[PDB]
Structures are given as structure tokens and as C-alpha cells.
Amino acid sequence: IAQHISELIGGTPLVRLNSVVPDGAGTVAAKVEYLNPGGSSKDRIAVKMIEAAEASGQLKPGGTIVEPTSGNTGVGLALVAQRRGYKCVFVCPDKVSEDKRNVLIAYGAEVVVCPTAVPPHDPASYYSVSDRLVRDIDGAWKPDQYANPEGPASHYVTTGPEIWADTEGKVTHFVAGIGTGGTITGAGRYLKEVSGGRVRIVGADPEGSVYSGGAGRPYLVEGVGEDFWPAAYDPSVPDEIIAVSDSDSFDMTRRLAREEAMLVGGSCGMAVVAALKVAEEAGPDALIVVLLPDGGRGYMSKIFNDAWMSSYGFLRSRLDGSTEQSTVGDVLRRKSGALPALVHTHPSETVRDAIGILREYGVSQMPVVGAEPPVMAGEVAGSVSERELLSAVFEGRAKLADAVSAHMSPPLRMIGAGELVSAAGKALRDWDALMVVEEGKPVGVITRYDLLGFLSEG
Amino acid sequence: IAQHISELIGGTPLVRLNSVVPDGAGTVAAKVEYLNPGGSSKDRIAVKMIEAAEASGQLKPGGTIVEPTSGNTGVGLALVAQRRGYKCVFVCPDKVSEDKRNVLIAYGAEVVVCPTAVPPHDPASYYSVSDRLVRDIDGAWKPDQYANPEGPASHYVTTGPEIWADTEGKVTHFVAGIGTGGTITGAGRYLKEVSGGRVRIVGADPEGSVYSGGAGRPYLVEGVGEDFWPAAYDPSVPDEIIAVSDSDSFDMTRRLAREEAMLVGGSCGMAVVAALKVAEEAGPDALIVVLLPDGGRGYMSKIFNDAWMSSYGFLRSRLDGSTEQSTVGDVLRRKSGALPALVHTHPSETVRDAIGILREYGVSQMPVVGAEPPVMAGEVAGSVSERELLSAVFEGRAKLADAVSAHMSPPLRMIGAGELVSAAGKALRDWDALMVVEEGKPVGVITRYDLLGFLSEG
Amino acid sequence: IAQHISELIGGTPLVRLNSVVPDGAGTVAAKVEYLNPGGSSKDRIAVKMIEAAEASGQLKPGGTIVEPTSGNTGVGLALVAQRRGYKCVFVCPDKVSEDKRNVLIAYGAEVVVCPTAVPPHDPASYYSVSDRLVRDIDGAWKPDQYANPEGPASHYVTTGPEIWADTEGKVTHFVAGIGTGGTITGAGRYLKEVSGGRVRIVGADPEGSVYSGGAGRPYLVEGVGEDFWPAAYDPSVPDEIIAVSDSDSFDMTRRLAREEAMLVGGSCGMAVVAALKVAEEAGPDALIVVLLPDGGRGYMSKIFNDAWMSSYGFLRSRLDGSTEQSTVGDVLRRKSGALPALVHTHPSETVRDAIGILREYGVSQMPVVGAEPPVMAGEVAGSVSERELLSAVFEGRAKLADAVSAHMSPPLRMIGAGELVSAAGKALRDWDALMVVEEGKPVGVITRYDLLGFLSEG
Amino acid sequence: IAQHISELIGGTPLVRLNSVVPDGAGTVAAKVEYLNPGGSSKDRIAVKMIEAAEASGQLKPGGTIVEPTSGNTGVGLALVAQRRGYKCVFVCPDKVSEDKRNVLIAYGAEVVVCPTAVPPHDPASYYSVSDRLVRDIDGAWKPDQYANPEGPASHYVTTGPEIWADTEGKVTHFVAGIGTGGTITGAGRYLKEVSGGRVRIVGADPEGSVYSGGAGRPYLVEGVGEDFWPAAYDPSVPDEIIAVSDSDSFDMTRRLAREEAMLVGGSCGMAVVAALKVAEEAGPDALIVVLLPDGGRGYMSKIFNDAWMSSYGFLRSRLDGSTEQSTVGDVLRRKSGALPALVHTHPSETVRDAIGILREYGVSQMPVVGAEPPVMAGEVAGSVSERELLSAVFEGRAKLADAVSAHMSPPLRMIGAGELVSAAGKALRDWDALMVVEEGKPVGVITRYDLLGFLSEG
Ligand SMILES: *Cc1c(COP(=O)(O)O)cnc(C)c1O
Ligand SMILES: *Cc1c(COP(=O)(O)O)cnc(C)c1O
Ligand SMILES: *Cc1c(COP(=O)(O)O)cnc(C)c1O
Ligand SMILES: *Cc1c(COP(=O)(O)O)cnc(C)c1O
């Protein structure tokens, strides 16, 4: 009978992947690490760190833990400091969703939010505010997960021995996502100390990060990636930092959850792809132990959601099956399959009236058609674009009252209404917008803004 | 005691204008013609026309009058055919407002509406439908106010004699708006028959019409103007067709109502301006009798409304007084003086997120500013325009996930917030949109579309 | 050649009504008075009043005319003071529409608006503000159309003589709307002075006014009616104040415009109905000269509009023809003939969920039906009314989580969907709302609020 | 090195609760069961069931698994049938959220949704559709988790032995949530077979279910509860079914996650409360092993969300701290702290106009105040309620045109604007709505519907 829930942190199993790695390649054992009571791998470091603050006497009993959290370290820190009874207060960037910090609260942590995207060194970003809280509050102890030797030491104590024992001293490689830099350092250091120099440590890094040799970048895979060299990552340990893209990592995570029964996150997919790559230059008899460090339940609406995964130019395929059943006509069915009367103007109306219709119906383009009856057979006289009108009106090139026929641009190209949205993207790749001619007659205009707004919701 | 209300049609007074004509010029007598019981001058022709259908036996008792109406001829035709008891049915273009045809109904006329802007010779325009009604109904009699000699004959009988008698055979000129062509023909013909060739007939025509020698045009002044030669306008009568613009005619109508106590319409202002012009080449001792043919009560929301009169690039000044106490900041106060926190993005957000904010807030431009706190002192890093983004995203020049800082355009110019809207127009005459820096900090972006949308409502 | 437009004020014709008065009754001559250049009868008094201010020296040249206007007196005052050149400034209640005061401005009058419905004797109503303007401005002259003897004197001079001459001293009665009290006083006084006591003066008054013996009332017919005794109405003149209702006056105005070719207003209809009534107790050989004092062009959207005329429980019939073609189902077609899915709940859902659906869809009643498929054949289990739920929830009689089946009221009655809206009114006269069963299945619920909201727009 | 991820299902730890159980009571060991690879306890049964279909030859290789899922059994069934390679297809009620079935898909399961709340025995509910799928598809095998002996047998094999071994044959009681009825049956049967009759099995059941002796009820705690007797629950095993309410279970779950570092669900809280209750009649030396069967990550927005937890009359306190900082005035700040103003009417306006304002502003009550200036000092003349008006208007008791002062109800009571929302609830408990008098003047009316709409969002 365990004494607290934070005593079961460790000894996580070591299962193997048998359907993602190709045939004729070494063994890939994925050290599933989302079975910890805290949900992620960060629990390991958490425990160790707290222990230090009790041995070094640097965290007097009843003191408060202050920390600029990421979302996973907070979970473990709360889960443990709640056993000891230390009040915990985080300072989180508003970039974190409501569910994540709601969990962070449910564990008994006080989360004070501050704006984001501001420079880290100014009073707005959460680093300076965390320092200010450290000053004001008494008995504060900023664990500083980025420059804390205990971080990597904890993995050196209780992540290498598991890797070395579950395989019986037979592990050719050890690939692991390198984020803030504790898992690879504290694990590879021990794997090398206990195997001479046999097991070559490899570290996967999101494409275009500091470790991978590139410059900064906006990062999507939560966890891995950095813009500076953490004080707790000795760059001498890893032997090959194999960088991997973002689309590849997300697709690998999805395919892993679908073909191996593991709900791993983004960094997990990145690590698995880095492995499956390194597992080629190591022929048969190779044993690559990847470190899947998260559980893919928090991302359930972030990378398993075809909508989000499609907004960021991603989503090779859909989770359930067939690819693109929706056709361009459905882009027009925002009113529940209710293609409204083709907002149209005639070669005799007034430029002011054309601008009026454009403003009143929200649309930004309209085919001037020679018959108010919306039944024209592809013989629309021209096209009027609100931008072009406003330009010709504010540059004296067209009086407000002038007839529209003297300032209308050439007609805009046409695409069928029963054609797939991928074809619509391919087409709009070259023009600004185009009218959908549904069995002879036009029924509206699909435009870049509208297509890219539809992709991001359905 | 008159027998019917349609017996008082005629003998309308002849008042003179004494504040619009400059000093040192002849006398200008304006034959106010909106005192007829039917409201306009068309009553004259109406009566005559009906009489013909009773003498020529071409309108059997109990028959129906069918006519593609304009709005004034309908009033007189109803007012008279209601005395005789003839059912009247009009076919009106939807271009006519609700008040006009509502009046046309209140007199007991049946108005059947058809779409407009369609060619006159097709089954959609009201000419063909009027002919179809003439066929179907029995005893129909299409008066055809455009090719009816009785039209001009009525003015020859009861509009020249009034002009010739109220002035005692002393009239140098007779200027009159020339629309469908009865008032000038039937009046000048008599003025010449009874004065040899002394009184030189002049006819005003809206700028760019058939009579003025130009080609077709979208017409705003209701009444005057045409696109073809009516069969009832003998072009030999008028001696000088002095064409006048639209802004000039509207301004003259407004100034006439303000400085002469006459609520005349648009054609009235056109005729008065044509007079005031011809009254220069006729030195002292000239007596120009203009024919103001309408009453400016129907246009009360069409040319006396600063909003409408400003949408069509018009409105030199406002009715009441000072010019432009508008200011550009008020363009931002669409939420009741509630500047909207300035939608912005930062040099680190994702292109997808910038497009997201643009779509979500409706705005089409946004300043990328290096601090989420909306307090920047004119040091915004750049500007992002939804069009430019969507272009760089659908042309492969920018991944959806790429940082915005790599695809942001140069900053957009600035204008004060306490500056008049005329200055805003002068500025936007050269750029696409500009941010209003209100005492150091920016508070939004005013754009061509927004300014031209505000002018048309306030 | 008149010298100014305000010289033609007077001598308005005297036409007779020959289709509204029944058979076997005296002659009814309606002194049409909307042919004055200013549009209404008030011009008469206006002229006279101004003359006084010039003879009595009480209005020094260049002085300003201040007046709490009604809408017609302003027109005449502007039309004349613009001839003299006196700056005119009105103070109008916000109850006046935009078109009326827009006209009042177009004539060159400065209209300063103040809130309405406030007591007349306080600084908010326009009487006190008019007095304040009289104090501040110099040379001000508040004509005070309510306590000015010149008002009735003007009609005594130039409205009785016309009535007495156009009929050749043969007029049995003279009925005229009695509003502020000048037309009846100044006309009947002369008719009696010049006919001994023969011509019995009659005065029509809106039902429930001071003159008719009743108490105050909210007045709709613009003009006639008062809440106090004006200082310029000698109650000894009129011999019978025959009060008339509002619906009767509006219907008489409409029928007059349709069967006599006169666009008279509301007071005109009231006067005509009062006449047609008095013309019964005066057998053959009676000559009743009604005084139609307004022109029905300003009300074109106030009493000739079936929408407005129907909101105030009016509108016996429609202007054009057949009565009530719209059927109850069209009340549901607010989404363009798009029945809204029939928001429903089931006997197992939670009271919280029922309140949720009610709030989310705006509706206030919903039939609990035993099958989510909206195809039930009139076997809906019950009805839930948001009010009843909220009551049973805030009075502890139903937990938020309790099943709805324990707090649902009896079903609400049903009416067909192809039945006329008049039937719907007759039905809702007894219940709170009822579901429209369209050929077996229900398709929604029409409610008092919805029906009375539809009547007021279509 | 495990062979598949579904080999680690079992041997879940047995941690003890040391802060929720009061002092002077036996030991409470909570067999945390959310550490299974599939997330919940259902994995156990899942494995066993699949094994049967392979030994009994009742699931031919390549066959499809059809099952009307709940949300947890689906996870385990997918996780295992994906190891064997059996296509899995679920039929889920639309009551399940998007995240749950999205997870269910990510594992490679085909989820076909059908409407809910329909009777289970009809073709609309998912039972009949599941049977239809069993018929159509080939090799189908409906596991039927409700009438499958293997269900309870699996817990008999691998849930009792763990309970009996982790405690060394020393367990006085075994309390466990009783839902579909496998955990208590298959565990208590073994605990009794191996301990004579010592360990008294107890089973917690949501208040008002079949097992607890009550009738049906709408159930909120996902999992536990039933409306019929499952064919796989032998009611002879449990010795005391201690029923527990819903609010109690949710509060216990929240307090457990906050004071024991366990994110358990709803059934977990119910089981823990049932334990903490039974642990009173068992003095010192008692060892109650509760069975927490779920992980509280899916409910993160269902019971840890103060909004949802407050809509269903719940939420004793908030997760973070102080109770009700929001005051009634904030209920009015739906427009971002911008009380619209104070829609009002005056004792002279028309009933039609009062109904008009009510309809136009959405509000359902309005104080008739004797001064349009919204500055009245608590001297509002009356109150008008749209319902009352519409009633008095459709029952002939008030003409549309009648003055409002004759049909206005007594004023509605007042409450301060800086008072807490709990006070507002206490007040509205007795009236229909009340106006908030903010430092003397009124600033609006808060109504039951508005308060209960605000509670459900903030
Ligand atoms: C913490 C974390 C990692 C590993 O970070 P380290 O650099 O090893 O400390 C990987 N993925 C995710 C999602 C993480 O949160
Ligand atoms: C009819 C009309 C005229 C005169 O038209 P004619 O060509 O003389 O028949 C001028 N102005 C308006 C507004 C008219 O309606
Ligand atoms: C002024 C007016 C009257 C007549 O008012 P008096 O009391 O005669 O001065 C009648 N109807 C209307 C619409 C009016 O404006
Ligand atoms: C399955 C389940 C249980 C236990 O159900 P049994 O009746 O033991 O089969 C308890 N809680 C939840 C949330 C469950 O899903």
C-alpha cells in the first residue's frame, strides 16, 4: 500500500512498437512514460527537485513554490508539493488553454496569468513577474527547471537504470526528444558511463531550433524546442541531433495512436520519427529505446482535431477515412445549403450602388450580369471588386455617380460546384476569387478568404 | 364651387425669384407649377389626354388605363380617371421608392411591379409587360405619354396662354426643363406663333443626355433626361439646349428652397440654373419665365438629406450650418465612442493566427506591435493586411505556420484623431488605409471602405 | 407676377365631395386648403401674425422668431419670415419625425430639439426652453400661436369671406376641426356676424379631448386636440362640438383619398366625418362647408401605411384589395419560408437542459415530444414554458437536475398552418400561445408576442 | 519488454487516502485504477472478453466488433482489438461529447452516431441500430457488456487477487461503485470465497437508481447508475448498497483531486464518499479498499468547470478561492461594463409604443419613469411587463392606442448594485424581477432569466 500518490512515480514500462517501424530493421522499444501518476515524464524531475529543497534547507517548511510553468512541470510540481503541503503558485502565459491551467488549479495550484508574446526580459512577460513574486512572497523557491542540475540528475538516477535494466544491458541507441534538456543529458550520460561508449545517444529536435543549428522559430509541438541554450543541457552528450519537421511529427503521433494503441503527444511523435530514421543506419540487432514523454489526452482537440490540424497547412488525411468528400459548393452552404441570390449588379447601375450592395452583403466581389433574374448562362458582363471600385473612386478616376460599366474589370474565371475543395485550392492558387457555375448558371463566388475560412472550421 | 378636384388643374401662379439671380440682370419669373391639385405639372397633359380618349371614342366607358408610370404622370392620371371612374393600373419599375407608389395606390391605382435594369425590349422590363397587359385586359388604353400629340397640345393650349397673359405679351425668353419633351415643345411653339420669333425658347437638359448631344447616362434627377428621341418632341422648337450638371442642379434646388421659399425638386433646380445662365447673355429688360414643374416634398429624403446627397459625391455644404464638425476619430466611434482596443498582432505570432484575428474581428488591416499592451508610442513593428497574407499563403510564399515577422509589410502612415474627415479623405486619396495616432498612441486604422461607409450614413 | 411666394397664400378653392356623402343628403363642399404655397392652412395665420409684429413694432428688423413648433405652423412661419429676412429658430419635441423637421430646416429654420413626454412646465419640455431662448436671444418674438388674437383674427378676415363668397351667402353650416382653436372661432364669428344666427357653426374634436368634455388623452391625429383651454378659443362660438374617434377619422381620410381624389391628412378626415354626421340632421338644401386644413403628403408613411395603421389596432382593410391573404404559417417564415426545426425537449432531459434550449433559441415555449425526430403526429407529451420553469426552479419546487417530465405543463392547443392570421388572433385571444399543426405534424408555436410583432411589420 | 501496449493492463497500484477520511477512523486504501494503459478500469473486462471470442471461436479472425459504447469500454475494446487487428465499429448516443468519441476514433474505431433520448427498443436508439449492424456485417460479435459473464469473471480473476494480495489478506470491507455491475460482483465474490464471510462488500449507487431501491432518473455521473437490472449483476453479493447524491459525489471528486493529488472522475467521488461513510460504522483497525475506476482528465471541462458545475445547482465553492466576488451590477455588464442605459417608458406613451420598446430592446420588463432623463431618484411611476401588456391587449382590456398609465402594474422592488449575486438569488426567490438602484438612481432590471443565464456562463 503506497503512502501517497506521488510514490508511484517511476518504473514506467518499456513497450515495443511493432507496426510503424518498417520491415528489416532493428527493434524499437518505446519507453511509454505517460503512465506516471502525474501524466507526463516531468514527474521524475519534479520529485528530485523537491527533495533538494528539503535537504539543502533552501525551501523552509510552509514555503511557497513559484514557477513560470509550461503545463506539464506544473502538474508534477503540484502533485508532489501537495503531498508535502507546500503552497504552489504558478505564473503562466495566456497562450496556455483553459483546460490545461484548469487542471493545474484542480491540483491545488494558484495560477496567475500574464500577457504573452512580450519580451521575456520585460515586466510583462512571466519571467520578470515570477522573479517579482519570488521577491515579494516569503520562503519562495523558484525551482528554475532550466538551470537546475537536479533536473538532469533525477533522470540520471531513475531513467537510465530503467532503460539499462528493462533491456538487460543491451541497447544500441537511445533517441529522446531534447527540449529544455534534461532527458537526453541525464539519460545518455549514464548509458555511456555504464556502457563505455557503445550506446550512441541521439536527440530529436523540432526543425529550425537552436539545437538543430537553426535560428528561432514559433514552436507548435508543446515541450521540445528552445530559443536559447539552457544552463542545464551539456551539449557534449548527444551524438547526433536529428531535427524533424512539425507536420511529420504530428502525422507520426496520429499514425502511432492509430497503429500502436498509444495516445502520445507531439514530442512523442517527433521522438518516434527521429528513431524510425536512426533505425535505418543501424541494421538488424539494433535496440532503439525511444522516450515517449507525454500522454496525448490534453491534445485531443489540438492535434487529433481535423479542423485545427487543417488550419496550419497540415492534415495529410482525416482520422476516420476518405479524404475530401466536401466539394466547393458546400463552401457556399454556410446558410445550411442555402446559396443566396448571387449578389449581382448590372452594367447600368451606379458605382455608388455597386459599392452599396458590396457593403450591405459583406461580399467583396460581384459579377455584373445583364439580367437581374439570377439565371444567366455564363454570360455575365463583368466583375466588380469592392477594392477596385474604392480605388477608382478615391483616386478621381470614377465619379460616385458614373455608370458601373465604365469601371468594371474583366470577368472572373469559373469552376464547377460539384468539384472537390482541393481543386478549389489548386485553382485559387493563381487568381483572387472565382465564380462557381453550377450546371450552367452561376451561383456565387468563392474567394481565398472564404475557402481558407472554411478549411479552418470543417 | 368646383365640381371635382380635377377642375382646379391650371392657371398656376407666376412668382418671381429675387434673391438667386445676381444683380444687374433681367427679371426671372418662376412659373411655380406645384400648386396643381395633383402636385406636379403633369396634371395638365393628363387632363387633355383623358379628354381625347373620350372624344375619339378610343376609351370605352368602364375601360382600364394601363401605363408604365414614372411617378408624376401616375398621380395626375389617377386623380382624373378617378373622377371619370376608369380603373387605372400601372406597371412600375422597382426603382421607385415605397412612398411614391404608395401614393400612387392611395389614389386608387393598381400598381404591378416588375424588375428593372433589364433591357426595355425584353419581357422583364415594364414596357413589354405594359403591352401584355394592354393585350389581355379589355378596353385598355395605353396613353403612351412619349408618343402622344395630345401631350404637347395640352401645354400648347393651357401653358403658353398663361405665360403670355400673366406677363402681358412681354417675355424675352422661356427656359424649361426638357424631359420626355412636352413642356418646351407645346409652350415654345405657341410663344413663337404669338410673338413672331421674338421669345427665344431655351431648354435645359441634364449633362450628358441625348438632347444635349451626348450619349446615354444613369440619370438621378427624376423626370428630365432620356436615352432616345421621343416621338413627341419636335427638335426644331428649342433654340438652345443648355445642358447642366447634376451636382449643380441639386445645389440650385437646395439654395432655391432656402433663399426663395420654394420646395422645388431636381428638374426645378436644373431649369432654374439654366435660366440664371441664359439670363446673362440677355442684359437688362429681360423676362425669363422658368417652368418649375414639380414640388419638392417627395424628394424630402432624396436631395434634402445630407446622407444621400453625400453618398453620391455631392453636398457642398450642410443644410443647417457649419461644414464638417465630423473629425476622423468619430469614424472609430461606431460602438458609441468606444474605440475597440486596437486589434493587433506581434512579430512572433503565426501567420495562421494573424489571419485568424483578421477574420474574427472583421477588420482588414492590423498593426503588428511589439507589446500586447495597447500603449505603443508610434513604434509599431509593421502592418499585416489580410489580402497580402492570403496571397502569400495561397502562393506558397509563406507556410501557414511561418512567423508573421517574415511576411509583414511596412508600417501604414498615421493621421491625427482630432482631424476633420475631409483631411482623412485627402489623405486616403493616396494610400489604402492609415492608423489614427491619438495623442501619441495608435487607436485603430481608418480605411477607404470605412470612411466611404461612414459618409453614406452620417 | 407675384412678388414673393408668400403672396399666393389665400383664396384657396372650394370643391365639393360627391361620393362619400350618402344619397338624399345636403351638399358638402370641402374647402380644400392644402393648395396654399406653405402646404397647410396655418399659412393664413402665419402671415397675419408676422404683420402684427411689424405694425406693433414688437419685432425689430433683423430679429429672430422663436416658437415651439408643431410641424405646420413652422412651415408657414419659415416661408414668410424668409421673405422678410427674419432669422427663425424653432424648438421641437423629438416626437416629430425626421422628414418633418428636415423640411422645417430646408426652408431656412434652425430647429433645436429637446426631449419629450416631460412635463411642459419643467426645464426639459420645449415650452420652458422656448422661454429661455426668448430671454437669451435679442429681438426675439415668441408668436405664441395659442394665446394670440391675431391668430383667429386672420381667419376672421380671410377665411370667412372666402366661405361666404364662394357660396354666395348660402351656407347652412360650417364644420371645421377644432385644434388650438382659431379656424372655428375666427370663421364662425364672421359667418354669424354676416348671417345673423343662421349658419350653425359645428366643431369636430378627437374623441376624449378637453373640448369634447372628456379628460386628457394621447393624441394621434396631428394637429387637432388639446389638454387645456387655449387662451385664443372663445368657447361661445361653436354650437355643437361633435367628437369623433381616431379609427373613424383615419378610415375617413383613407376613403376620402380613394373616392374623392384628395390627399387630406388626419384632421381632414375627422372634419369630414363630423360633417357627414351633421349632414343628416340637416335635410335637403343644406350646404356644409368643411375645412380640410392639411395635405396628406407628410402622412404618406403614417396613415397610408398598412403596417403602422395595423400596429395601433386599426386598418379595417388594406389599400389595394383583398383583406388577409397571409395565413398563420407565414408568421413562422421569418427565415424566408424556413420553418425553424421545431425546438423541442423530451420527457427525460434535464430541467437545466430545457432552460438551456429555451435560452439558446430565443423561443419562450417548447413542446416536449417523445421522439427527437420532428415528425410526431400530434402526440407531444407536454409543453414547457420558460417562465414556468424558471419559477419552479427559483422557488425550490424543482431542482435544476430533476427530469423535465415532473414539471411540464399540459399540452398547448393547436391551430392549422393554412389558416388566416385573423383566426390566429381570435384563437390567441384566449390562450398564451399555440402550436401550428401543419397537415398532421407540428411545425412550431405561434405566440401573442410573435403575432403582434408580425402585424406591426407586414 | 512488453510485446504490446495492452499487456500492461493490470496490477494497478493501491494507494491510501490520508487527508479526506476524518481522524479516529480506519484505513482507507484507494485502489487507483486510472493507471491502466487504456485510462480506465474497463480495460480489465475488455481483455477478458476478447479472449473469450478467440477461445469460444465466436469471433472469427478478421471479424468486426460492434458495440453500443459508453465512452470507457470503447477505449479498452479499441486498444485491444487493435492489437489483434479486429475492425471495431461503435454506435454512440449523441449525448457523448466530441472529445470522447474523437478519442474513440483516434484509436482506430469507427463510430456511427444516432439520435438519443428515444426509447431504447425503437429503431432510433442505438440498441436496435447495434443489432441491425450485427445482422448486416459479417463476423460481427456484439460483446454485450451488460449480459456477459466474462465481464464479472475478469474482475474475479484479476481484481480480487490484487486487492487480496496488496493488503496481505487483511481487508475488512470493499466498497466500489456499482454501475453496470461487474466490479462489485466479480470482486466481492472472490473476497468472500477467500475470506469466508469476513470482508463485507459494500456498493455505492447514485441517489435514486434501481439498485438503491428508487425508480429511474436522469443520470449525470458518467458510468454508475442504471434503469434496469443487468443480466450480469448477481444482487446477492453486495451486503449494503449505500446510495449517494450527485452534488456530494461531485464535491468529493473535486476535494479528492485537491487534497489527495488524484484526478478521479464522478463515480470515483461517489465511491469515495460511500467509503468515508461506511468507514464510520467500522471503528479502528478497518481497511476499506475503494475502487476508483476512472481518471478525471476527460471531465476536466465537465465537473472541474465552475460554469457547468454551477448551471446544475451545484458548486458549493470555486476551485481557486473566494466565493462570490461578482456582484449583481456585473450581471448588467454584458456589454463590457456598459449598462445599455435604462430602457424606459413614460405615463403618457402609448401601449403600442411600450410594446415596441420592449420588442426592440429584447428586455421583458421596463420601469415607467416620469422623466426621459435617466436620472430618476427612485421615483419611477410604475412598471410595464411585456407579458402583462400583451395579455391586456389581446383580451380587449386595453386598446393598442390607450395611454400606458392606465395599464401599468405596481413598481418592482429594488436591490443594490454592489450586492453579491447570492443576495440577488435570495431576492428573486420571491419576485419575478427587480431593478438595481445604483447609489440612488436605477440602472436597469435584473430578472430570473438573466441571473440564471449569467450563472451558467461565469
Ligand atoms: C518536458 C518535455 C519533454 C522533455 O524535455 P527535456 O528537455 O528532456 O527536459 C519532451 N516533450 C514534452 C512534451 C515535454 O513536456
Ligand atoms: C414631366 C417632368 C418634367 C417635364 O417633362 P416634359 O419633357 O416637359 O414632358 C420636368 N421635370 C419633372 C420632374 C417632370 O416629372
Ligand atoms: C392647425 C391645424 C388644424 C386647425 O387648428 P386650429 O385650432 O383651427 O388653429 C387642424 N388640423 C391640423 C392638422 C392642423 O395643423
Ligand atoms: C464502468 C464504470 C464503473 C464500474 O462499472 P461496473 O458496474 O463495475 O461494471 C464505475 N465508474 C465508471 C465511470 C465506469 O465507467
Numbering used by the authors:
A (entry chain C), B (entry chain D), C (entry chain B), D (entry chain A): 3 to 460
Paper excerpt:
Single-particle cryo-EM was used to analyze the conformation of the native tetrameric MtbCbs. The Bateman module is composed of two CBS motifs, CBS1 (T329-E397) and CBS2 (A403-E459), existing in tandem repeats. The density of the connecting linker is well ordered and stable in our cryo-EM structure, which suggests the absence of any disordered amino acid residues. We propose that the oligomerization of MtbCbs requires initial association of the monomers via their core domains to create dimers, which subsequently associate via their respective Bateman modules to yield the tetrameric assembly. The 3D structure indicates that the dimerization and tetramerization interfaces are stabilized predominantly by hydrophobic interactions. The active site lysine, K44, is located inside the catalytic core domain on helix α4 and forms a Schiff base interaction with PLP. In native MtbCbs, the active site K44 is buried inside the core region by a flexible loop (G40, G41, S42, S43, D45, and R46), making K44 relatively inaccessible to the substrates. In the absence of Ser, a stable continuous density is present in the cryo-EM map between K44 and PLP at an RMSD value of 6σ. This indicates the formation of internal aldimine at the active site.
